[model samples]
Target: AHKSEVAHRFKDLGEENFKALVLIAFAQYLQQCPFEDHVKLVNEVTEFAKTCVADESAENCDKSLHTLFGDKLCTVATLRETYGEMADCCAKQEPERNECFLQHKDDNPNLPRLVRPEVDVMCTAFHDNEETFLKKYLYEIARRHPYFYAPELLFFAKRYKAAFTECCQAADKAACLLPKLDELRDEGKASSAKQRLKCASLQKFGERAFKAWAVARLSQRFPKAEFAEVSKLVTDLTKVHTECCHGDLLECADDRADLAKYICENQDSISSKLKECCEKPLLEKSHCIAEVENDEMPADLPSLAADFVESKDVCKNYAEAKDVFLGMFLYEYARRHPDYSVVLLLRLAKTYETTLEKCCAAADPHECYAKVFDEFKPLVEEPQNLIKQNCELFEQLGEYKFQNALLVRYTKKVPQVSTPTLVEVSRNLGKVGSKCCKHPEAKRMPCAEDYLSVVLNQLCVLHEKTPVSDRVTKCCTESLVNRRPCFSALEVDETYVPKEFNAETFTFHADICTLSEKERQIKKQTALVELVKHKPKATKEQLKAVMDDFAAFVEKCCKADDKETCFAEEGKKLVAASQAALG
Candidate 1:
């Protein structure tokens, strides 16, 4: 009953890469167990694998691992999943068995990095047996930097082996090896700085440009991945860079490592071209994938269509897997429309979702969605430009000036809005800029657009029932994805008329000087509203003067030796200047 199949694979630990790990595991166990006990444990594991392939459960495999390694054993360590995946593969029929075992044995980069061994513990191991110590060292390095290229890790192992040999013969073995360990740690950190530089390039170049680079670079590396798959993969990679580039190194590394596993898993669907890379020794696989480069695209490639938009079952698909559905639409649409930025693709994905929600609710879903893509094509450029221009403004102006710009711009657009409310909008918009502008340039537009919508949502709630400006109400009522774009197109309200300048409209109560800086800002914003509203006929130059006078008054008065006199004299002077601007 399947005797030959079980006998052939289990005799060699299933695959060469896996056998390398088994050899290391053997060396580790050799250090603690008597040779007799070690041989017995090895025999037990061989029987366990044979039983697993023939039809036994994972429980025995877990027990086998515990018998060998002894600590938390299966649940916490990566060994559990690695062995379980191999077991699942072996359970398959002979033809599928080899590839299953090979693919399943590939390590996930997202797995936690291993803790470094203590210098004293390593020195003790070195003094006990040199070969066993070196094997363990190689094993630890392989697990710790699982994504590193094979040759790179072999080089690391070779260097460490030499250092350990010299240090073990020293007067103080642990002390001699400690600095060597520190050097390796620093080298690991130094290599990660490459990601920082990549992120910096993304931040400096636009998202559209960065994506084009990803397309060119990734397409060159995995020529067999095909155009559509490469588009989707780059979109996915962009998501990782967008989120992780904002200073989350561990998460970035984890996410990136997970992405590497994803490509290897979907070899046939994505890129069987990387099969060469995948077959390389586990240590060399990722580097092999990385180093492959062919500039020419595959001949006879077909175009991707907006087929996802026309799916009659879109609502159900979205309900089952919203992100996956949206991601699919992005992939299809993006392949055909490589000129669009990730921000535009995301917006289009959102629009597709919203259209589905409407169409799926209607009597004829297909007819309702028939013209969606056609209509969206004409509207794409507006949002693309809005987000790009907004990011530029936020980046160019800096936070304080950007917030002030928002305040001034909003006030001029809807003069009827209360000073405090406009100030709130400006403050929140500035916060959005503060949060997103420093992100990778590819990420800034979407981050700004999404967050700006949130800030606008707050403004929408203020006039949800009773309308403020007809245009504001109209803009606020648009779909979430369209709200910012609607607001971007709004013209100034013509119905509002300026009231005459009155000093009493703003107060310079001496108590304001003692307020916290936060409280002081609110006071200044209120003053800004009064200054802007009263001088509606004034040029930007005149408004700037009056506001500058008011700001200077506050700053000087706050630090004056006599607060009461300073407020009294400066308040009078500012009032006179404001009335002069009213002319």
Candidate 2:
């Protein structure tokens, strides 16, 4: 029944062995197919195996059954169902598969005891099938192709070797499976006619793995260091290994050995350099020391301390520094020298209160009273604890100064001169804003007043700088109005018109002129003024109307837009008008 007229591909076996040959070919096909394709092949194999298992009259039926069963096997029906279920097990696309697995768990009562080992065997077989497919596919696509010349083939061959190495490293439970891979390599070597091709392919895999292992070890040893150059060197060596192993790129055997030796020799130096790079900065070294260490202060502390010292010295020269100095020094001494210096803290506190009164009289009365009261209240009301508690108070003072700075910025109209001051104010205000915005009960706290004051002061400064037409200004004003009695106590008066309106009157008259030439001349002058006052509160519509009217007036009077003509005509008209009025 299995006789062939054409020359038999494997005719060594007798006529009785035809069925066994067919079964083996089918089994190989089932093993080589991809997971998704394997489902259909499994169904075909299961049906063929079932026929062999059932047929009592067929020759060599027992041999076919033995081949199908092997050492550990499942019933044909069970194998078919397992493959079918696996094929449909994409959880994202098939919800039924989850239910099917759950149902299978409950329905099969004896399945737990009898089928547990069978299930393991089947899973192992399926995994082996996948590995076989990958090995075959890689050799065919990379090894047999003409387009994948020396360089290109070597590149892909290295990638395959890397993948194989990774698989071997990951397989802790099944070390015996590695020998099968070695057998595959030997089979590939024997099949190839060229001796160089056989040797190159075998050696490349080992070289690739070794280089990768070395790089990984180096990376772990110097985790924080930038070892990109070292990584590149390892990668390039791996490529060279592939080219030499696969007979793709021409390199003498001695050259490959020398390259390997060179890498091994420099490995220690590379590792040592990486370690040095990763080491923490040496603070004891003169030039390498941090700025704060050089300056005799903590690095993490803000530059506010330096600014405060400078500002205090300036105030001292101006006879305004006494109170601030007393308050800060007392606060610092109380905190740092608490057990040794309570009496001094009290005396300094009293001196601060007295000096604050005098300074407020000389400078800003409201701010002065506020500062003295703030300092005095904490010292007098709080228990006479040895430690000075002033973190909250210092924060309040910083915020207070920030708000006062912003007040000067807005009231004096010093946007150009006070940019640095405003930036510092904004930084302080941002901290205050973050605190207020976070805490719900912060609104009720007395400290909240100081915090909100900074925030409102920032908003008020923004409002003053914002053009009247800006939506932000309008929104802020609306918010302030709705939330009456805010910390800022902002009073948005509708009665106070912008100075832009006063400038608009003169602008309108220039716009109404009928002479095109005269209008153009006036428009040019207006444009220069507009450029100088670029941040005016006028709306776009207002500016456009003024420009359009000026252009129309110029057209009506001069019948042209030339500046010289317009000026001469206007001068003549002005002389006529003056003479007529006099007569």
Give the per-residue Cα lDDT of candidate 2 at 266.
54
lDDT string, candidate 1, 1-583, tens digits: 3333323334422443333344334433223223344344445555655665665344444243323233212222334344554445434554454345334433343545557667677767777886556555565554444333333444455567778878877888777887797676555543443444356546755565456556644543455556677777788788777755553222343345456667777777665567677764444554455555333345654542335655566678777986556655555555444344444565666677788888888898878887777757756767666656766898898877777777777788888776777888888778777777677654455456545545675687676675767778888766444555677777666667886656578668777878866788877877777777776566778777877887778777777676677777778877876787668
Tell me the spans in candidate 1 whose CA falls farther than 4 Å from its real position. 1-331, 334-378, 500-504
For residue 384, model 2's alpha carbon misses the true position, in angstroms, by: 22
**TM-scores of the models, in the order given:** 0.43, 0.15
Model 1: worst 10 consecutive residues (lDDT sum): 66-75
Question: All candidates: CA RMSD in angstroms?
Answer: 15.7, 33.0
Clashes of each: 3, 10
lDDT of each: 0.59, 0.36
Worst 10 residues of 2 by lDDT: 286-295
Per lDDT, the best of the predicted structures is 1
